[PDB]
Design a protein around this ligand. Structure first.
Ligand code: HEC
Ligand code: HEC
Ligand code: HEC
Ligand code: HEC
Ligand code: HEC
Ligand code: HEC
Ligand code: HEC
Ligand code: HEC
Ligand code: HEC
Ligand code: HEC
Ligand SMILES: [Ca+2]
Ligand SMILES: [Ca+2]
Ligand SMILES: [Ca+2]
Ligand SMILES: [Ca+2]
Lengths: 441, 441
């Protein structure tokens, strides 16, 4: 009953369809590793050290998951580094497959397998019960199309079916804009919300299940990776506490040419229509509010860099200790400190909207990160001393993404060449096959 | 022209006088060192390590400056640890003496010299031009009675006489509720605002003039002491950015029995009259706003303790390094880090209102503190190593105020006994002299 072919809905819902399509205008893709090469060091051993960009329009979700170095260059349906779960927050064909094959059936196997199947842009069936007769009437009929997100909302005491309209508005966004990890042997998406959504809760959660995303290749620390915790951090901030919904800012009610009200589906920066977003609740002018938000961004950026610098030193200092013959027992307390420091930093800044949604919480989290970084480096200086090393550990030149990637042993020329081959040759075949199978226009 | 005898105004301005007097109800004097023994270590070698309480009602300003161990037990007008400047933010007799003796003359002398002269409670002439014929008519005629405060407001580009009513309201409070230091041979009160009011501005200011408040007796670090930066931090926070004045929250307009409006002079906790404070601008329930403010208090407290724990270790590790033979040159970089780390911590939490006035700014400052503390301790571990020490430096038992004070070499029994003698013997003599000379009663 899932209709992943979004254009099916264009005749009946032109205003929503046209604005939805318009996120294709949000096309600039900012390379975050180029901007901040420290990230390559922090994520050494993990695919984020190869390729990490800031988000752009929803229209690009399928493209970007296909093009990122993180998904590699699979040669067949059982090849490639990543599992099916990488599709989960990119396309309504995910809802289609979960319905068709069941949740476990969907998650089984490799990302490559989904290539000729997950082909429609993030769209109507991701957020709407389009099968309801009320939908054609122009009623939204919001729904959670993602069972793992439904379970998560229940876990935090906010079951979707019991939630009011305004709670539901943010929850649809909360199907994807969250911290997650891959759970069990099928690598199913799970939001680590069992103990609560605060950084401390999630840290306790992951430690109790002895989970790690990867081992940092420099320090051998069993690491946790944070991802875009918008739902969690929005909940923590002033707007979320007042149930100012994601939609209030990102999907304002606007008028069509005929003066009819509809929800603007061109999901982007709220400051691009300040008059219909912030101005709904605030008397301050646009420049005044922009300056405040920019101020928080700078405050957080400055502290974020300080934490990252401390962590860069910590990873290289851990490397020096290992290279000097440090044992597993000797390294363990240091690795615990690095893991916790970096977890707190990563959850703090992994959402590019933190300085807006919950600046005070971002700053708090960074402070607690810094505490554990201090511990790591102090433990390390003593351990290194016991090996006869009493000088400051020198760091290689990591002033550029290229240098940082070189330093951690990536062959970026080759990795990029192989991906480019994959993009040019495999993607068109995937699209051709989906068309032949009637999954794609 | 200054009338320091507040009761003079009782018949003319009963509603203001009676509510002003009622801060005597805010009488709990909470021992901050008892609640947080870490403070004794951080302030080791400074009077705050002896006695530091949370603020109470304005009515207690004179008694509290008299009774604190910080001002000691002077035997005569030329004795005691502190200068005349400690009276400055405590009583309208200060305004009287500045007029009578000039500002320079007022500041010249030890604190003990002012004892028989500075006897009336913080009051009308501190905030009002009581000599103005308009004041007798019920007009506030707000004034800056403190020249050093007028100069500071000028230094931040806000000359009082050009400021509007709303700006002036907070400036009156900003005569005392600020970070300050003692300047020159006369030890005049000066606000370190010449380069701006941000922690970074003040830090650079104090470093440029190579100023220090004391030398920490453990680490031998040339330290800076922060004090109650409400004006600076209020300015940084969301309320200050919107010119929500100190008065809007702490001195609301209320009605008397006859239904006539007056300004409530019982300056205390805004939540005591939520209906006429926050509820004028906010639609949220009292309990909802209390819960948010309490959450920020906890967030800041948690991080505050983490920074203090790091600084406690840093001071004792510095002590260990000095004990191991570290030279002045070897210690300098470490002491630079300790100085900066502690300055940032102290300014962050020296205001008991920070979690309300500017929580994000308090949190930010603490993060920057933690950066420099990490640096201090890492440097220390390497230095200690060069002296043949590679183990963690153990800390004495500081689980209570009494233990911490013992640990840093204070004879608290002696100090308290000497102060009790002074309080019981000298204070009545001061009051008798003041009454004799028509200053009191
Ligand atoms: C499996 C490990 C993957 C891979 C390879 C990708 N995703 Fe996601 N994704 C989600 C959201 C909300 C965003 C935008 C917000 C943000 O990025 O901060 C993204 C973005 C991306 C991109 C574009 C940015 C980039 O990293 O270069 C790419 C290439 C990408 N993803 C690949 C949401 C989710 C999930 C919600 C639970 C899940 C699961 C994933 N993504 C998984 C993956
Ligand atoms: C989440 C990322 C969504 C996508 C993808 C689509 N829609 Fe949407 N829609 C969404 C929200 C949060 C809302 C507002 C609900 C509310 O409580 O106000 C809507 C609204 C609609 C409506 C109702 C009419 C209106 O308010 O404009 C319709 C008919 C609608 N949306 C249609 C629609 C179409 C055709 C989509 C694919 C092109 C589509 N939506 C995607 C959330 C999301
Ligand atoms: C999973 C199906 C998602 C749902 C439901 C929502 N979002 Fe999303 N968003 C998602 C991805 C994978 C991306 C990145 C796309 C890319 O190719 O980079 C985004 C991006 C955004 C952005 C950034 C837009 C830009 O930079 O131009 C915003 C502001 C955003 N998303 C907000 C948002 C809102 C408010 C949602 C509920 C209505 C929502 N998203 C749902 C994935 C998914
Ligand atoms: C106003 C009170 C908002 C609410 C509620 C939500 N968002 Fe937001 N978000 C808002 C602004 C003004 C900005 C940009 C800040 C800037 O410096 O310009 C953002 C940012 C995001 C992003 C980052 C997008 C990017 O291009 O980097 C995302 C992914 C995002 N917002 C999503 C999001 C979600 C999922 C929300 C509900 C949980 C949500 N936002 C609420 C304004 C507001
Ligand atoms: C109502 C639906 C709102 C919209 C749209 C925006 N804001 Fe908001 N804001 C709102 C409330 C109810 C509050 C709490 C204060 C109160 O009135 O009780 C706020 C608060 C802020 C703040 C201060 C808190 C913070 O998180 O820093 C800022 C800086 C702020 N709002 C900015 C802002 C911006 C930039 C918006 C458009 C992107 C915006 N708000 C929309 C209510 C609502
Ligand atoms: C204005 C620039 C001041 C100067 C100069 C001094 N003090 Fe002060 N004091 C001031 C304020 C605004 C407050 C309340 C806010 C707070 O956080 O404390 C105080 C409080 C006191 C107290 C009561 C609390 C305590 O510390 O136990 C005492 C005993 C006190 N002040 C003493 C004191 C001394 C000895 C001074 C000279 C070094 C001194 N004060 C100067 C404002 C100002
Ligand atoms: C600062 C700590 C003050 C003290 C001490 C005293 N007053 Fe006050 N007063 C203060 C302010 C900030 C205001 C409000 C001014 C405004 O802009 O609204 C006032 C107000 C008055 C007034 C005006 C009438 C009114 O609003 O109630 C009068 C007549 C007055 N105050 C008298 C007064 C008396 C008699 C005092 C000593 C007992 C006194 N004030 C102390 C600031 C401060
Ligand atoms: C110096 C002459 C001051 C002026 C002018 C203002 N304040 Fe004050 N305040 C001052 C001191 C020395 C103290 C501590 C008194 C003690 O003995 O502990 C205070 C205290 C406060 C408090 C705390 C009250 C309590 O805890 O019960 C508050 C909330 C406060 N002050 C606010 C305040 C306001 C709003 C002012 C402008 C109208 C103001 N103060 C002026 C010193 C001085
Ligand atoms: C509302 C927007 C306020 C503004 C403007 C000012 N203050 Fe405030 N302050 C407010 C509250 C609700 C509280 C108590 C917080 C709590 O946890 O209950 C405070 C606290 C203070 C304190 C500390 C008092 C204490 O007893 O520890 C002081 C000294 C203080 N406030 C003074 C002060 C000054 C000088 C202001 C203008 C520069 C100011 N406040 C503004 C609420 C609000
Ligand atoms: C009008 C003169 C106000 C009074 C009285 C109080 N607040 Fe306020 N608040 C006001 C504004 C203009 C804003 C900015 C948001 C906006 O609407 O533009 C706020 C914001 C807050 C916030 C969020 C920001 C923050 O500093 O954390 C909180 C938590 C808040 N206000 C609480 C609060 C309390 C507890 C008050 C009484 C002691 C209070 N406000 C009074 C305006 C005004
Ligand atoms: Ca973007
Ligand atoms: Ca994760
Ligand atoms: Ca108090
Ligand atoms: Ca000071």
């Amino acid at each position: 009953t899932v209709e992943a072919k979004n254009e099916t809905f264009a005749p009946q819902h032109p205003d929503q369809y046209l604005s939805w399509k318009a996120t294709s205008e949000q096309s600039e893709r900012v390379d975050a590793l180029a901007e901040d090469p420290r990230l390559v060091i922090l994520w050494a051993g993990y695919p984020f050290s190869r390729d990490y960009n800031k988000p752009r329009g929803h229209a690009f979700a399928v493209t970007d998951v296909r093009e990122t170095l993180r998904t590699g260059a699979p040669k067949n349906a059982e090849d490639g580094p990543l599992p099916m779960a990488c599709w989960s927050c990119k396309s309504p064909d995910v809802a289609r497959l979960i319905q068709k094959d069941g949740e476990d059936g969907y998650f089984h196997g490799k990302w490559a397998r989904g290539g000729p199947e997950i082909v429609n842009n993030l769209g109507c069936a991701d957020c709407h019960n389009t099968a309801s007769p009320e939908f054609a009437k122009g009623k939204p009929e919001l729904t959670l199309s993602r069972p793992y997100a439904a379970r998560a909302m229940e876990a935090i005491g906010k079951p979707f079916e019991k939630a009011g309209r305004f709670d539901q508005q943010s929850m649809v966004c909360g199907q994807c804009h969250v911290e997650y990890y891959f759970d069990g042997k099928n690598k199913a998406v799970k939001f680590p919300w069992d103990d609560g959504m605060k950084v401390e809760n999630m840290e306790q959660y992951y430690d109790k299940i002895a989970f790690s995303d990867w081992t940092n290749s420099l320090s051998k620390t069993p690491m946790l990776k944070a991802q875009h915790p918008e739902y969690e951090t929005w909940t923590a901030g002033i707007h979320g506490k007042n149930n100012v919904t994601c939609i209030d800012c990102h999907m304002p009610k606007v008028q069509n040419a005929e003066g009819k009200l509809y929800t603007d589906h061109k999901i982007g920066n709220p400051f691009d229509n300040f008059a219909q977003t912030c101005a709904n609740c605030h008397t301050q002018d646009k420049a005044a509010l922009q300056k405040v938000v920019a101020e928080r961004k700078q405050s957080i950026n400055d502290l974020k860099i300080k934490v990252e610098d401390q962590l860069v030193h910590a990873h290289f200092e851990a490397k020096a200790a290992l290279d000097a013959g440090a044992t597993e027992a000797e390294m363990k307390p240091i690795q615990d400190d690095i893991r916790h420091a970096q977890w707190r930093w990563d959850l703090a800044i992994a959402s590019h909207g933190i300085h807006m949604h919950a600046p005070e919480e971002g700053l708090r989290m960074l402070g607690t990160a810094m505490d554990k970084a201090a511990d790591a480096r102090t433990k390390l200086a003593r351990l290194l001393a016991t090996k006869g090393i009493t000088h400051e550990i020198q760091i290689p030149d990591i002033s550029t993404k290229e240098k940082a990637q070189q330093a951690i042993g990536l062959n970026m020329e080759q990795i990029k060449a192989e991906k480019q081959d994959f993009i040019k040759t495999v993607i068109p075949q995937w699209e051709e096959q989906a068309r032949k199978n009637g999954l794609l226009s």
